[PDB]
Amino acid sequence: IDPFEMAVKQLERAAQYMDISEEALEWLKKPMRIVEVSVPIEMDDGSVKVFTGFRVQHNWARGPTKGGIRWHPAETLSTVKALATWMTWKVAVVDLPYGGGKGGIIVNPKELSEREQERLARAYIRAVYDVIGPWTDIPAPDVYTNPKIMGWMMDEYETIMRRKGPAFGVITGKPLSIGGSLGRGTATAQGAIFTIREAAKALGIDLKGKKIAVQGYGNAGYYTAKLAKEQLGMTVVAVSDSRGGIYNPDGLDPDEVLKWKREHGSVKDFPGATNITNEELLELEVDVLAPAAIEEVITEKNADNIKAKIVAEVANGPVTPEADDILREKGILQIPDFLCNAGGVTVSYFEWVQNINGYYWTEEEVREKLDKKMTKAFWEVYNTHKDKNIHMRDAAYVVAVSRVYQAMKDRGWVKK
Numbered sequence: 001i002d003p004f005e006m007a008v009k010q011l012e013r014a015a016q017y018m019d020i021s022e023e024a025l026e027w028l029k030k031p032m033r034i035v036e037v038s039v040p041i042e043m044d045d046g047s048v049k050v051f052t053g054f055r056v057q058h059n060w061a062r063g064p065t066k067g068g069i070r071w072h073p074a075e076t077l078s079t080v081k082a083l084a085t086w087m088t089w090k091v092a093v094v095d096l097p098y099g100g101g102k103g104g105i106i107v108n109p110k111e112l113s114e115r116e117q118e119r120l121a122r123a124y125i126r127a128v129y130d131v132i133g134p135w136t137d138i139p140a141p142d143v144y145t146n147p148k149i150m151g152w153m154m155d156e157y158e159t160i161m162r163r164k165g166p167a168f169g170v171i172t173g174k175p176l177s178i179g180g181s182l183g184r185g186t187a188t189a190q191g192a193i194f195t196i197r198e199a200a201k202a203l204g205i206d207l208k209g210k211k212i213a214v215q216g217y218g219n220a221g222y223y224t225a226k227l228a229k230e231q232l233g234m235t236v237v238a239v240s241d242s243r244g245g246i247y248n249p250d251g252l253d254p255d256e257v258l259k260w261k262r263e264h265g266s267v268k269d270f271p272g273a274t275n276i277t278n279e280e281l282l283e284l285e286v287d288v289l290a291p292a293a294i295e296e297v298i299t300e301k302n303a304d305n306i307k308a309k310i311v312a313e314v315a316n317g318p319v320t321p322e323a324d325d326i327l328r329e330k331g332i333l334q335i336p337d338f339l340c341n342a343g344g345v346t347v348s349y350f351e352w353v354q355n356i357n358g359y360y361w362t363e364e365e366v367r368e369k370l371d372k373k374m375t376k377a378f379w380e381v382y383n384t385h386k387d388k389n390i391h392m393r394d395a396a397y398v399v400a401v402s403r404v405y406q407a408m409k410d411r412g413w414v415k416k
């Protein structure tokens, strides 16, 4: 199927640039555990509806598997497996003691009521309990899943486990009142900012008063722009959603931008600025560029038109491999997508650590630890990029797969 085959092809393109045994490659191609279950719930009308849930633990060589849960009507087993393989490298690049996990249910939660959503969450936990756990498999928020659902599922897991172990730790993204952690909402953007100034440091150019352009202005993009302005001293020059765009070389403020979006219902028509299109924004000449929108916005059709020195792929796969190569041959440093967005995963790991130990950190402690881990991961990726003379995304794949393969070899799973 298209997604899993794409993930396997990406793993092969990673493996051709690093010393990996054939048995290890075949072992990585087949996910360790796949659990397809029927999740029954009782609707408000009294009828019983059964959905199909998937729980794919791609690997646990480096530690307990970690992965999000997607409630999407278009969910497929291949998509879940591919995203589990994704999360494996996501946790591997940033040195987490995690394996790759991925949960999902074939369900459209638009018409599901709050009672139905709670029942679906609890029933999914009742179905997949035997293949999850704090030390085995940690679910995390993903598309169409909010931390309220995770409060529900943590409650269900605690009820089944009879409070015997660290229940909070079974899942992450939980509300602050119950085993939650600070910085979860801004996790991905904060990690992206860490990678951005690390890229600037690697390039040898500071960020005092330079330009950043973000394309796609969801929560992640808005937080990225705001944190960049607050910390790096950079000047945001353009913000856009999939609908419209804003141009202001003099400088913007993400707070008033989001307020205008909330008032008017769209981000466009910002006062003191020009309405612009997303396409020319993608080719805008800036210092830092961050695509935070629907996947594959930078294409071979316009890859050479990007002039920003640093491209931070905040979104997952916003650049096609050919555009990645074109930017590489243009001297453009690209932060790979799964390394750039690993802030959410790192903060989720921090939440898991806080839940396991029963001690909860403060926001400053979480931010400092996230900064340290992101800096180390980025420097490992950059050093591999320099030494092996391969693409930055290629370097991140190489380091992640090397860590996973080392974990397997030390575990004795693969002899060679």
Ligand SMILES: NC(=O)c1ccc[n+]([C@@H]2O[C@H](COP(=O)([O-])OP(=O)(O)OC[C@H]3O[C@@H](n4cnc5c(N)ncnc54)[C@H](OP(=O)(O)O)[C@@H]3O)[C@@H](O)[C@H]2O)c1
Pocket: 141, 142, 143, 144, 145, 146, 147, 172, 173, 174, 184, 185, 216, 217, 218, 219, 240, 241, 242, 243, 292, 293, 294
């Ligand atoms: N662990 C936690 O505690 C926690 C808490 C919240 C969220 N999260 C995670 O972080 C993500 C953020 O949550 P959320 O509530 O913001 O999800 P959401 O309800 O999908 O909102 C994301 C925002 O991004 C915008 N957006 C989506 N696709 C876009 C595109 N192609 N172009 C431009 N804008 C786009 C949306 O606005 P438009 O539709 O107008 O574009 C939307 O307002 C979630 O997927 C969730 O998994 C985790």
